[PDB]
JSON list of N, CA and C in Angstrom, two decimals:
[
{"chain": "A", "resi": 1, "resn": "UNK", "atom": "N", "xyz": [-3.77, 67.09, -18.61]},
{"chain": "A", "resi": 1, "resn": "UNK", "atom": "CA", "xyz": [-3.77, 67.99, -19.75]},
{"chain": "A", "resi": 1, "resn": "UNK", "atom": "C", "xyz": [-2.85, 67.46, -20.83]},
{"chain": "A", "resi": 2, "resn": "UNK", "atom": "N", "xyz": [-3.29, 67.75, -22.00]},
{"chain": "A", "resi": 2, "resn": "UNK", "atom": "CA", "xyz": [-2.24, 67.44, -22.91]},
{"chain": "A", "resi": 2, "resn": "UNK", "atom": "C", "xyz": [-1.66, 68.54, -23.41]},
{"chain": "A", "resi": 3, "resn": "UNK", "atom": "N", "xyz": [-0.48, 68.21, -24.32]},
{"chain": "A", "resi": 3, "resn": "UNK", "atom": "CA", "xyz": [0.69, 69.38, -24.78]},
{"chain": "A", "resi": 3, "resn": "UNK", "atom": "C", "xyz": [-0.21, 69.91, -26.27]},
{"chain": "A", "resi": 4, "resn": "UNK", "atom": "N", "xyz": [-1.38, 69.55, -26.69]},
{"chain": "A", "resi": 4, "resn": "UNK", "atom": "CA", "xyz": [-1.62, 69.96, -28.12]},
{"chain": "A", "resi": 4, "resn": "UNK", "atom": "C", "xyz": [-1.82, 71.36, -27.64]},
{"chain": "A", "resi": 5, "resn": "UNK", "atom": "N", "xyz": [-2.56, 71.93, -26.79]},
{"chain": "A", "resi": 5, "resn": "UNK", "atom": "CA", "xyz": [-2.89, 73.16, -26.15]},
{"chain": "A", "resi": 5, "resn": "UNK", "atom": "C", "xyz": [-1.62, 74.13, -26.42]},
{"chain": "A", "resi": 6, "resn": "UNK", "atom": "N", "xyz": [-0.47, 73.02, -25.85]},
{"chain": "A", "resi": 6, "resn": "UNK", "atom": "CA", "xyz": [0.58, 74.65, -26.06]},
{"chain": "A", "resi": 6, "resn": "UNK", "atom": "C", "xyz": [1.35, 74.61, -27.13]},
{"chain": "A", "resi": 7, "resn": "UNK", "atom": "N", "xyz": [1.58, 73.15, -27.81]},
{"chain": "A", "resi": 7, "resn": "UNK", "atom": "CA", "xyz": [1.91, 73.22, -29.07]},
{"chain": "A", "resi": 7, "resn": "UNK", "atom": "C", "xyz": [1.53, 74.01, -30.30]},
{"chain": "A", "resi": 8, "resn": "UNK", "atom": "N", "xyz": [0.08, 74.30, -30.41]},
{"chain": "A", "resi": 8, "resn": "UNK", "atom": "CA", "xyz": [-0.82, 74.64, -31.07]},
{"chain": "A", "resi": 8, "resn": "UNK", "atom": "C", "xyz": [-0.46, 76.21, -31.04]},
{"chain": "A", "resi": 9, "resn": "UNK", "atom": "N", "xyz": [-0.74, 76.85, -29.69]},
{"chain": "A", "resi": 9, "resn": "UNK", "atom": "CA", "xyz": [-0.55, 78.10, -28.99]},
{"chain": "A", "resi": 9, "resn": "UNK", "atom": "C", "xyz": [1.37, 78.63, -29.28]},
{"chain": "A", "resi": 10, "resn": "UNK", "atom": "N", "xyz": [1.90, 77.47, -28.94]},
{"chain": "A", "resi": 10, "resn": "UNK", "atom": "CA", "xyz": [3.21, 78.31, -29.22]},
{"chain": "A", "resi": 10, "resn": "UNK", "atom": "C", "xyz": [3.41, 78.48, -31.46]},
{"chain": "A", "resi": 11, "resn": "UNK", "atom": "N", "xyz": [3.29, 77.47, -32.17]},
{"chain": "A", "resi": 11, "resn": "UNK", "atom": "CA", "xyz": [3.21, 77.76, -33.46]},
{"chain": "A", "resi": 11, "resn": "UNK", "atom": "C", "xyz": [2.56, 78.80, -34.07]},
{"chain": "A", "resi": 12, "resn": "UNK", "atom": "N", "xyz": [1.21, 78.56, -33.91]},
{"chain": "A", "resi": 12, "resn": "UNK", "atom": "CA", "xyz": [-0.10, 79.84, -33.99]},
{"chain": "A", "resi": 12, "resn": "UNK", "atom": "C", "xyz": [0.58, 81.51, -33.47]},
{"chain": "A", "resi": 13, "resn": "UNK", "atom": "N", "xyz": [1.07, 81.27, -31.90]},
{"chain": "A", "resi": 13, "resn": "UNK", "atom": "CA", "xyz": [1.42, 82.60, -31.77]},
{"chain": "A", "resi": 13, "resn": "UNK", "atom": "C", "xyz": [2.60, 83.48, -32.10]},
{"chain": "A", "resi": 14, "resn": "UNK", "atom": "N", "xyz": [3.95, 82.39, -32.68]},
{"chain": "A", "resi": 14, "resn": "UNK", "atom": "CA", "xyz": [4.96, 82.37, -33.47]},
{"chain": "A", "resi": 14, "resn": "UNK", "atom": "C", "xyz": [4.94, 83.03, -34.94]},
{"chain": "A", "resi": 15, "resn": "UNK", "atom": "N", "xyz": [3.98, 82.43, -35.29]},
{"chain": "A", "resi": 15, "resn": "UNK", "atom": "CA", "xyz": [3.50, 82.38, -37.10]},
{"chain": "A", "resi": 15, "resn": "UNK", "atom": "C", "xyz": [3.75, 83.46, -37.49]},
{"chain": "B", "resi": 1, "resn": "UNK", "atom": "N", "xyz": [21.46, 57.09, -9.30]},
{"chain": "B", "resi": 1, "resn": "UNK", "atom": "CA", "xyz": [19.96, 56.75, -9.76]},
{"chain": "B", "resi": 1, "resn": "UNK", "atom": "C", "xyz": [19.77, 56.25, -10.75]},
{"chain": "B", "resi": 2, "resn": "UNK", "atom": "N", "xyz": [20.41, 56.49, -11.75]},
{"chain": "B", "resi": 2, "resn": "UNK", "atom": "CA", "xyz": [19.69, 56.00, -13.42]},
{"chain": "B", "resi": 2, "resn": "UNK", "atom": "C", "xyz": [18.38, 55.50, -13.14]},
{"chain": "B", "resi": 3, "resn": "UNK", "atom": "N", "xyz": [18.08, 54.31, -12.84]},
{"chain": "B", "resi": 3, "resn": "UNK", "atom": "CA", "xyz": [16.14, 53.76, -13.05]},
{"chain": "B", "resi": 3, "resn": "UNK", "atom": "C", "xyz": [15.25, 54.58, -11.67]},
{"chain": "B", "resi": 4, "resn": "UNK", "atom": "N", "xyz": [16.40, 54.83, -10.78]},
{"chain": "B", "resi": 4, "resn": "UNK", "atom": "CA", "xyz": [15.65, 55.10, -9.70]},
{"chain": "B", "resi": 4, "resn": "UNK", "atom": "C", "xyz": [16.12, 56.75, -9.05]},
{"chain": "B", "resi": 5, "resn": "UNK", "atom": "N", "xyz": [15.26, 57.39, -9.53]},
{"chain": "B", "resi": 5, "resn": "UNK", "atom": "CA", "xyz": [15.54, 58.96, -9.28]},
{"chain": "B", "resi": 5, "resn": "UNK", "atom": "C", "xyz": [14.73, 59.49, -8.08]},
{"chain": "B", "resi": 6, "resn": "UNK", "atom": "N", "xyz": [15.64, 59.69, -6.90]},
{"chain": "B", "resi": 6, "resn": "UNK", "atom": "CA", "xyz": [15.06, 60.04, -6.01]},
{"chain": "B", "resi": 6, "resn": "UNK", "atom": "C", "xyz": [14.52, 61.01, -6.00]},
{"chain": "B", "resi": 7, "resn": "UNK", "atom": "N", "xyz": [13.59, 60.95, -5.75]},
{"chain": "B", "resi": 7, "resn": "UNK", "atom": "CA", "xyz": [12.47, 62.10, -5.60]},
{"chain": "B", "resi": 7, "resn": "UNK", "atom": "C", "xyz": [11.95, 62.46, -4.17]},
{"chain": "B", "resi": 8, "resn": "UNK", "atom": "N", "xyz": [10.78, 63.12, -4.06]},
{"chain": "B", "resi": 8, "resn": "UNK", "atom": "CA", "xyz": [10.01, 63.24, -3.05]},
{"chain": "B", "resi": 8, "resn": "UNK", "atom": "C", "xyz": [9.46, 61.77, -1.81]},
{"chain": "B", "resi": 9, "resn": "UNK", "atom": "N", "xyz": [9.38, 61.24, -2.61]},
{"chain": "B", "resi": 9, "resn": "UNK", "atom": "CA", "xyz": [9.33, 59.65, -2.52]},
{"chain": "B", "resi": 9, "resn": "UNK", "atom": "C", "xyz": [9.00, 58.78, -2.94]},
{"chain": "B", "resi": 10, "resn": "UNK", "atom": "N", "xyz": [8.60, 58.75, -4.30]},
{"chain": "B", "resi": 10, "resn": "UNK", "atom": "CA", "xyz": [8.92, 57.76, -5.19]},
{"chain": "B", "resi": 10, "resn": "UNK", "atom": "C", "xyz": [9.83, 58.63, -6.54]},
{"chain": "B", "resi": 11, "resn": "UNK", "atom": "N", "xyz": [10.33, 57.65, -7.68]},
{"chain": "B", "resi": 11, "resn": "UNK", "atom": "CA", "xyz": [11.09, 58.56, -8.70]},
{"chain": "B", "resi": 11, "resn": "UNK", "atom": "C", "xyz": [10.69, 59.32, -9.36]},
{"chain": "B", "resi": 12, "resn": "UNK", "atom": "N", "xyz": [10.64, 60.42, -9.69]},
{"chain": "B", "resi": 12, "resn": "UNK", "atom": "CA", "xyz": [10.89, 62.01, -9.87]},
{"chain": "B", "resi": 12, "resn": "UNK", "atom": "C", "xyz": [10.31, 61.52, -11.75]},
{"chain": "B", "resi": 13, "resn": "UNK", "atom": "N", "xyz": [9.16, 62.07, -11.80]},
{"chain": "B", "resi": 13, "resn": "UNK", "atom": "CA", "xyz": [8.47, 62.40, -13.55]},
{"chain": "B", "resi": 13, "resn": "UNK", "atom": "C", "xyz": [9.61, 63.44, -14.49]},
{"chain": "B", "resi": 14, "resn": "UNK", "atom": "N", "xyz": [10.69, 63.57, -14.29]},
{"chain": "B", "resi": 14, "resn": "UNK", "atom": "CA", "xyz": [11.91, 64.29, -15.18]},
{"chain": "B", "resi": 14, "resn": "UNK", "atom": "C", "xyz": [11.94, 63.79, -16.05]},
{"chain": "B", "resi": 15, "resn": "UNK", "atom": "N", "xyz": [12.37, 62.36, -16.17]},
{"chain": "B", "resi": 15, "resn": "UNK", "atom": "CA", "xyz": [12.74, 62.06, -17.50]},
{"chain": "B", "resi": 15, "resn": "UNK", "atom": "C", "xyz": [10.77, 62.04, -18.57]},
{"chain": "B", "resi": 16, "resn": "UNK", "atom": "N", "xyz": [9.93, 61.18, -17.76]},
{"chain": "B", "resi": 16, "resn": "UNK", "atom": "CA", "xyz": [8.63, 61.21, -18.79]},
{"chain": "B", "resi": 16, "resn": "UNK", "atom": "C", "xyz": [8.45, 62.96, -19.62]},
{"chain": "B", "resi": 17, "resn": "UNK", "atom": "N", "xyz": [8.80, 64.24, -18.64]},
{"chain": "B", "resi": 17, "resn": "UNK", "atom": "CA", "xyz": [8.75, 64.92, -19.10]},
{"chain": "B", "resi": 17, "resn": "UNK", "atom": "C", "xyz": [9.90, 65.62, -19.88]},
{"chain": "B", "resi": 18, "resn": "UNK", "atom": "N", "xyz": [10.90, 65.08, -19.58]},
{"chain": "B", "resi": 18, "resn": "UNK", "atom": "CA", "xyz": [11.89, 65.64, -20.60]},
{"chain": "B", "resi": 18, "resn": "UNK", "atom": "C", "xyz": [11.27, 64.81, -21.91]},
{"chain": "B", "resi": 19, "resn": "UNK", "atom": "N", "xyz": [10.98, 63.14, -22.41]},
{"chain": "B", "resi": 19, "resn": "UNK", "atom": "CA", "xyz": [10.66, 63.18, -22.90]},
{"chain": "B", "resi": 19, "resn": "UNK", "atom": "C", "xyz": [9.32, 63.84, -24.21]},
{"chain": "B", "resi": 20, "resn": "UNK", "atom": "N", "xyz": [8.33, 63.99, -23.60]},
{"chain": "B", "resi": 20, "resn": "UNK", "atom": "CA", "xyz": [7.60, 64.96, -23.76]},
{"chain": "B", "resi": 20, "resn": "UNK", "atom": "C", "xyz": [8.39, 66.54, -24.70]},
{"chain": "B", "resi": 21, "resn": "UNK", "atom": "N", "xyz": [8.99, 66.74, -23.98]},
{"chain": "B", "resi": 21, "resn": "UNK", "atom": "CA", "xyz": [9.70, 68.12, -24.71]},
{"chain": "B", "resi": 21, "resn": "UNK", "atom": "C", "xyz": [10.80, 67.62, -25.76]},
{"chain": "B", "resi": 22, "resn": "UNK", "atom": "N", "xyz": [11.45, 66.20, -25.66]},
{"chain": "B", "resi": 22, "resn": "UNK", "atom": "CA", "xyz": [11.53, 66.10, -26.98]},
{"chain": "B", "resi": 22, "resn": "UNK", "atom": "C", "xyz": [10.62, 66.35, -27.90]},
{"chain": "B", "resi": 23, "resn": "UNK", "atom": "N", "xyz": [9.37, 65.30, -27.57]},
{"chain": "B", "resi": 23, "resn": "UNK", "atom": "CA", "xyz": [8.54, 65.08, -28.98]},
{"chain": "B", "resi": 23, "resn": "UNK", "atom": "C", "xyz": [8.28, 66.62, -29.42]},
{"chain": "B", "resi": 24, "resn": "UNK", "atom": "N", "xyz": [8.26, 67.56, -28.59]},
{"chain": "B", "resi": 24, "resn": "UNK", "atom": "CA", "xyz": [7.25, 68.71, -28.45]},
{"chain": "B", "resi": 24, "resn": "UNK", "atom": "C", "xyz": [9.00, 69.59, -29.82]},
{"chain": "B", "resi": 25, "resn": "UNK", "atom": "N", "xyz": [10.28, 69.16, -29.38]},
{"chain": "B", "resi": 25, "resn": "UNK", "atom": "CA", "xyz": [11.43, 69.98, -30.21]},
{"chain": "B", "resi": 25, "resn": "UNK", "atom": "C", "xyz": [11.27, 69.32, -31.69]},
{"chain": "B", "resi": 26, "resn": "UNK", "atom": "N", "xyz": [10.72, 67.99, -31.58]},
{"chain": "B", "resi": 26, "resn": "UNK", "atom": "CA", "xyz": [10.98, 67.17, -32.88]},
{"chain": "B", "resi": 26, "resn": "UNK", "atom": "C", "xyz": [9.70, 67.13, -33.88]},
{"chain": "B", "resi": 27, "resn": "UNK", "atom": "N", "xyz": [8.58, 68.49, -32.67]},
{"chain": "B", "resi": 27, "resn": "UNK", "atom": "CA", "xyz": [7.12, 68.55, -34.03]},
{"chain": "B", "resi": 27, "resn": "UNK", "atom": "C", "xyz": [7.87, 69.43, -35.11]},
{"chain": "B", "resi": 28, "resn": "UNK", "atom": "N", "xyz": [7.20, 69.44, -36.71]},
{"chain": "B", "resi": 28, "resn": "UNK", "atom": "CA", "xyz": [7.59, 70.16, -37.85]},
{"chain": "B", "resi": 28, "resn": "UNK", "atom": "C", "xyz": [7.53, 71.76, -37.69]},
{"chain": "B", "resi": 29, "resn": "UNK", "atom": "N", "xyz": [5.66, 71.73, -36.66]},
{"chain": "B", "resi": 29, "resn": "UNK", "atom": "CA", "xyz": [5.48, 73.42, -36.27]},
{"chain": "B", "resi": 29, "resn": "UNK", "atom": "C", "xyz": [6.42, 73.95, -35.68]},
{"chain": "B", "resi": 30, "resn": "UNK", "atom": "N", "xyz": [6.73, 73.39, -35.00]},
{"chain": "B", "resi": 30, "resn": "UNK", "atom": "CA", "xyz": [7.42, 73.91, -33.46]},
{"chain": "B", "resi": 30, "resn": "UNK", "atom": "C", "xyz": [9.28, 74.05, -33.98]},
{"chain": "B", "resi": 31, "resn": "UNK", "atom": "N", "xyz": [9.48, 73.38, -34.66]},
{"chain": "B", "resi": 31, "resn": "UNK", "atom": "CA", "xyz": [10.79, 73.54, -35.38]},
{"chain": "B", "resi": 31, "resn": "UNK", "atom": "C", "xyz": [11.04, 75.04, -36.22]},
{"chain": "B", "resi": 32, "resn": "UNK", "atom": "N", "xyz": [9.94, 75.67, -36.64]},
{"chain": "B", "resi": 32, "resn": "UNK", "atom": "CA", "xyz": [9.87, 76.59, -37.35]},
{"chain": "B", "resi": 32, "resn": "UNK", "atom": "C", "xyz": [9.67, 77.67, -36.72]},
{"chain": "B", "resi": 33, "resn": "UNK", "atom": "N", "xyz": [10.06, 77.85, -34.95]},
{"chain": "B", "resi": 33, "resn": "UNK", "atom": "CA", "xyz": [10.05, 78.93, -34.11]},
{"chain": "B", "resi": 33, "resn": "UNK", "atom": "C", "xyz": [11.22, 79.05, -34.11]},
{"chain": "B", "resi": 34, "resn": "UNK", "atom": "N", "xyz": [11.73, 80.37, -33.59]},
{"chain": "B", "resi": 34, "resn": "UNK", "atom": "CA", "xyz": [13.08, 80.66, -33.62]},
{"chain": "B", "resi": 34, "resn": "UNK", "atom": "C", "xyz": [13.39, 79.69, -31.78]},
{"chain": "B", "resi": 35, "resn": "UNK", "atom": "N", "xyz": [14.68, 79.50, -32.27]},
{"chain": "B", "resi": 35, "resn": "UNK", "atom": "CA", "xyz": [15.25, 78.60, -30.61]},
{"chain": "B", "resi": 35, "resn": "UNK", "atom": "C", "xyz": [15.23, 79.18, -29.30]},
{"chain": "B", "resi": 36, "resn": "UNK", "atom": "N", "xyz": [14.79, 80.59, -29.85]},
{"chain": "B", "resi": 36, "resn": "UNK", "atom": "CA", "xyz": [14.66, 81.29, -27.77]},
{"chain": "B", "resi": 36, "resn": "UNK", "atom": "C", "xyz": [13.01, 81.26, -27.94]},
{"chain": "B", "resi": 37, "resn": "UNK", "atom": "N", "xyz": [12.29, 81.14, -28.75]},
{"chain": "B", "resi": 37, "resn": "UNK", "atom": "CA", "xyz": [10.75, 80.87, -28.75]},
{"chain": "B", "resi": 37, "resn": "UNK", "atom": "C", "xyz": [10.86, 79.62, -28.34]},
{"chain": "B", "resi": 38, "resn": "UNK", "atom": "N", "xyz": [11.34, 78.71, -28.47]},
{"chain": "B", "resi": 38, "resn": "UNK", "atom": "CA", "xyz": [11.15, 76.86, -28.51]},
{"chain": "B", "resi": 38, "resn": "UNK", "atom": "C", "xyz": [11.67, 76.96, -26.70]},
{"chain": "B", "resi": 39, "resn": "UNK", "atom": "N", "xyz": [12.48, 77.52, -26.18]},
{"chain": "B", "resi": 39, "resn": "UNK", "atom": "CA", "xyz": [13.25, 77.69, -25.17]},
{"chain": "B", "resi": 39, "resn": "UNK", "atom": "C", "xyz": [12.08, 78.36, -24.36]},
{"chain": "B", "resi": 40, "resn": "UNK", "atom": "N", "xyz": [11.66, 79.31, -24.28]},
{"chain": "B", "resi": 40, "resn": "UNK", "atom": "CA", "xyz": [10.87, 79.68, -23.64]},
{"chain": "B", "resi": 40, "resn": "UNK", "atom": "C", "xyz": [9.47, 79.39, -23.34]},
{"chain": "B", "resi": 41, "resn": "UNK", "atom": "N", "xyz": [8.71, 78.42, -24.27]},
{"chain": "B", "resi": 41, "resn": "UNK", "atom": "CA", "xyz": [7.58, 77.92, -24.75]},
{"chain": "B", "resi": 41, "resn": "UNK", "atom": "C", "xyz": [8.24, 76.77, -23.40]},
{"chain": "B", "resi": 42, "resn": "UNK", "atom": "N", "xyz": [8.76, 76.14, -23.53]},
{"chain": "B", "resi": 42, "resn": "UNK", "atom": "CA", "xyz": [9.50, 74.80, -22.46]},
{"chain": "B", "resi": 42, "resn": "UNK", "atom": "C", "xyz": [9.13, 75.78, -21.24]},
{"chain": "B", "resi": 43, "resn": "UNK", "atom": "N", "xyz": [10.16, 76.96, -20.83]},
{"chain": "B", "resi": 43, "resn": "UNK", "atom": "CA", "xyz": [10.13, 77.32, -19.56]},
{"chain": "B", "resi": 43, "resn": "UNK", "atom": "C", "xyz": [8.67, 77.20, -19.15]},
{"chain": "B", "resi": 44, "resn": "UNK", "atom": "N", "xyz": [7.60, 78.13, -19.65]},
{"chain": "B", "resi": 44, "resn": "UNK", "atom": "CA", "xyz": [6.62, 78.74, -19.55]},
{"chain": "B", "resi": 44, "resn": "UNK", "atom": "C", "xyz": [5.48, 77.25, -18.88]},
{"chain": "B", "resi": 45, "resn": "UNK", "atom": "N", "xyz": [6.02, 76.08, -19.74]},
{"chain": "B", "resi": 45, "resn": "UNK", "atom": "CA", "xyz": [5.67, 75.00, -19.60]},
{"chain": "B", "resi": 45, "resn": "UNK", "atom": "C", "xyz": [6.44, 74.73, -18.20]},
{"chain": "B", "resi": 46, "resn": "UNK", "atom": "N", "xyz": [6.83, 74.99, -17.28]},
{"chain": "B", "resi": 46, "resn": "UNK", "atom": "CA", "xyz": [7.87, 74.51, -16.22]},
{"chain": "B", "resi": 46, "resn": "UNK", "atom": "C", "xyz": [9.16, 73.78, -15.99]},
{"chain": "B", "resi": 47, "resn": "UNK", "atom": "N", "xyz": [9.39, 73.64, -17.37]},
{"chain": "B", "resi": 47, "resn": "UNK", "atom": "CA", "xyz": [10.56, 72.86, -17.20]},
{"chain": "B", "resi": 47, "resn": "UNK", "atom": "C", "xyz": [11.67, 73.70, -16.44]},
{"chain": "B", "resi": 48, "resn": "UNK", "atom": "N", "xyz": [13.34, 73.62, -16.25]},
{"chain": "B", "resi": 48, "resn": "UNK", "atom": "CA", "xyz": [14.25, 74.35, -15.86]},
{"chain": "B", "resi": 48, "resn": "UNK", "atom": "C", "xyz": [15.27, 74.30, -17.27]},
{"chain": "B", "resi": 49, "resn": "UNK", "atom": "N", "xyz": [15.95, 75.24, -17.13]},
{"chain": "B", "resi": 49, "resn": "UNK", "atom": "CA", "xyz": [17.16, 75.23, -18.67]},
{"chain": "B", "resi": 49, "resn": "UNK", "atom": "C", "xyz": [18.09, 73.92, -18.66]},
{"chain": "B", "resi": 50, "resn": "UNK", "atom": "N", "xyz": [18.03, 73.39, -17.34]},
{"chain": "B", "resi": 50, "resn": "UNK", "atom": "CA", "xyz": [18.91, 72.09, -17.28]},
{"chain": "B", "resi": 50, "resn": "UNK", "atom": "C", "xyz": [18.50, 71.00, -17.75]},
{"chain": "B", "resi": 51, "resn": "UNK", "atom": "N", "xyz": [16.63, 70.89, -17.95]},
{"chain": "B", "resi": 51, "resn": "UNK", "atom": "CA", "xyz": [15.64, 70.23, -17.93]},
{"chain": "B", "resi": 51, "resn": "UNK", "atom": "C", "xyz": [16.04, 70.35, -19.84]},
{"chain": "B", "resi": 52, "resn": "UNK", "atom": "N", "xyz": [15.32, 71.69, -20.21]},
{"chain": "B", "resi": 52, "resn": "UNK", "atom": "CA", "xyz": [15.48, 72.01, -21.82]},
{"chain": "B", "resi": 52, "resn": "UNK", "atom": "C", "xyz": [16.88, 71.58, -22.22]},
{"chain": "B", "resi": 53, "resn": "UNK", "atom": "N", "xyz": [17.79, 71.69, -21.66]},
{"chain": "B", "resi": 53, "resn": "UNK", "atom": "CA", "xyz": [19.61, 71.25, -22.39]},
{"chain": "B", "resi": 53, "resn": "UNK", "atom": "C", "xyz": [19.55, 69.88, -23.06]},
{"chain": "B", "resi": 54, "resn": "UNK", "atom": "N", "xyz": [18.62, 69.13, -21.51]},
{"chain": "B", "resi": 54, "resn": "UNK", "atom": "CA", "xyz": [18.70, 67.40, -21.76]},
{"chain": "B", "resi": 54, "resn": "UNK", "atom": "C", "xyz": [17.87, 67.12, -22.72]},
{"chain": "B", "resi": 55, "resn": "UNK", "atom": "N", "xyz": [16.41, 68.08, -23.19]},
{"chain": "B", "resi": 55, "resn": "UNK", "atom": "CA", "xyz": [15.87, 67.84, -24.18]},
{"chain": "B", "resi": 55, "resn": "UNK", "atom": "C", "xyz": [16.58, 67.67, -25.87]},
{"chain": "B", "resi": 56, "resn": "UNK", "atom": "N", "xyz": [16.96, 69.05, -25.76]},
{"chain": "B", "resi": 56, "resn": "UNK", "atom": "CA", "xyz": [17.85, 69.52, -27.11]},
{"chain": "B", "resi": 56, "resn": "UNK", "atom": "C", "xyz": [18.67, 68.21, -27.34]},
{"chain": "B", "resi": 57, "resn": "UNK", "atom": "N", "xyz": [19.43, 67.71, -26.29]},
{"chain": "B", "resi": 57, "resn": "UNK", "atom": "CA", "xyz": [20.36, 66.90, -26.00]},
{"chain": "B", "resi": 57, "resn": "UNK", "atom": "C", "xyz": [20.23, 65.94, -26.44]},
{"chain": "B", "resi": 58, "resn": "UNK", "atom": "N", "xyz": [18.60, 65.15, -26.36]},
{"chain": "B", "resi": 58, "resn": "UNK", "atom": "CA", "xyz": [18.30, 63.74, -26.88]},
{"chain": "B", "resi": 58, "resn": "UNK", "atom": "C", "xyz": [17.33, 63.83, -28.01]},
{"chain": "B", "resi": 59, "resn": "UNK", "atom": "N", "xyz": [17.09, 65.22, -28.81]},
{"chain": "B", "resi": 59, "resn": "UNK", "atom": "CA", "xyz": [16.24, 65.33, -29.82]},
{"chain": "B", "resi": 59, "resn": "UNK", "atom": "C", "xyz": [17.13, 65.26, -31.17]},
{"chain": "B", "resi": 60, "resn": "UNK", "atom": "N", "xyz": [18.25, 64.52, -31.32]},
{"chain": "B", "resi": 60, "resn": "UNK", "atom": "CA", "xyz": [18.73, 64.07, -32.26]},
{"chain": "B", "resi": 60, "resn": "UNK", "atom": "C", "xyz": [18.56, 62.83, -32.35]},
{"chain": "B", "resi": 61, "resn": "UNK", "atom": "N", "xyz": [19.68, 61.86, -32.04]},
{"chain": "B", "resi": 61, "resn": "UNK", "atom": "CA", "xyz": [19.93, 60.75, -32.02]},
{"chain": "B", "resi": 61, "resn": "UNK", "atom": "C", "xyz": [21.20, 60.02, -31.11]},
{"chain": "B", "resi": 62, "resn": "UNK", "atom": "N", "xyz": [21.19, 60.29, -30.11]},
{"chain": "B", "resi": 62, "resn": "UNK", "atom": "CA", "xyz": [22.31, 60.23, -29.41]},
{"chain": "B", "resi": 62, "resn": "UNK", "atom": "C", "xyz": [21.74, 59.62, -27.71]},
{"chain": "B", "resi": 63, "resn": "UNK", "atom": "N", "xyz": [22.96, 59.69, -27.06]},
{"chain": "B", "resi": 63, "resn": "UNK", "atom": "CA", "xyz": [22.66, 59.22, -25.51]},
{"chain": "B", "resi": 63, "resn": "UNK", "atom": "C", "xyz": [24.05, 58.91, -24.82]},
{"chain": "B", "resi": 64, "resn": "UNK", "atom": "N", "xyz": [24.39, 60.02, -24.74]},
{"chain": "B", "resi": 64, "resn": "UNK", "atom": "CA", "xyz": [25.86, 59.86, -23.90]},
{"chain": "B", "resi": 64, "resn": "UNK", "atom": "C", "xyz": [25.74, 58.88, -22.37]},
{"chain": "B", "resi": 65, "resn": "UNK", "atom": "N", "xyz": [24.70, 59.28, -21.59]},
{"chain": "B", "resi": 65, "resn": "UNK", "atom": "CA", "xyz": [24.57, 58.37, -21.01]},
{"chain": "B", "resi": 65, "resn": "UNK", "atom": "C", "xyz": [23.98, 56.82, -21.13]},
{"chain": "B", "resi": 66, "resn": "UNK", "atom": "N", "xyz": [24.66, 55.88, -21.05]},
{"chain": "B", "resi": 66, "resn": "UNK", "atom": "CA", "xyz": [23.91, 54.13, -21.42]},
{"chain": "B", "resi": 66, "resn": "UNK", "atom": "C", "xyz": [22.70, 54.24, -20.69]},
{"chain": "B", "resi": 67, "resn": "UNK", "atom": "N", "xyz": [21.42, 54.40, -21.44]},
{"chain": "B", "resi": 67, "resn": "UNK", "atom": "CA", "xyz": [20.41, 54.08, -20.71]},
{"chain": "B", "resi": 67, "resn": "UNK", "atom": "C", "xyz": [18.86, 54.04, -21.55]},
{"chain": "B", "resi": 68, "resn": "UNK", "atom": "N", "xyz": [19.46, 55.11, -22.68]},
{"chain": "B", "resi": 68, "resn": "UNK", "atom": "CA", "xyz": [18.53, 55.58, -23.84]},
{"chain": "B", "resi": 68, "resn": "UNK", "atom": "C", "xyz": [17.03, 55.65, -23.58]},
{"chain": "B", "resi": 69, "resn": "UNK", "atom": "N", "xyz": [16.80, 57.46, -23.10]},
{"chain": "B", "resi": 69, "resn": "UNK", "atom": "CA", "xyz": [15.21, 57.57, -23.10]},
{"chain": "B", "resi": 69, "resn": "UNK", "atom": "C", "xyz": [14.89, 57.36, -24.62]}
]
């Protein structure tokens, strides 16, 4: 797996 | 240990993944979470807080220990 998944998911759900 | 981190039985993926959670402290998005979001985003990911310290730790420019991930 790669980290874009939770990178993506932690910014996005931060925002 | 330094090169050779005993593990289970061969050396222990800690440091590949501490690295990893650098790159992951040093994205632009991810900088713009507050630090118990960035902290917990790591846990959730499995790391341990000792694991996240060493991240924070080498997401400047530094390396107290001679060995430089």
């Amino acid at each position: 797996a790669s980290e874009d998944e939770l990178v993506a998911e932690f910014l996005q759900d931060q925002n | 240990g330094a090169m050779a981190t005993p593990g289970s039985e061969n050396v222990l993926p800690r440091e590949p993944l501490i690295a990893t959670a650098v790159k992951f402290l040093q994205n632009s998005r991810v900088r713009q979470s507050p630090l118990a979001t960035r902290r917990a985003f790591l846990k959730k990911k499995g790391l341990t807080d000792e694991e996240i310290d060493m991240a924070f730790q080498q997401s400047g420019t530094a390396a107290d220990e001679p060995s430089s991930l």
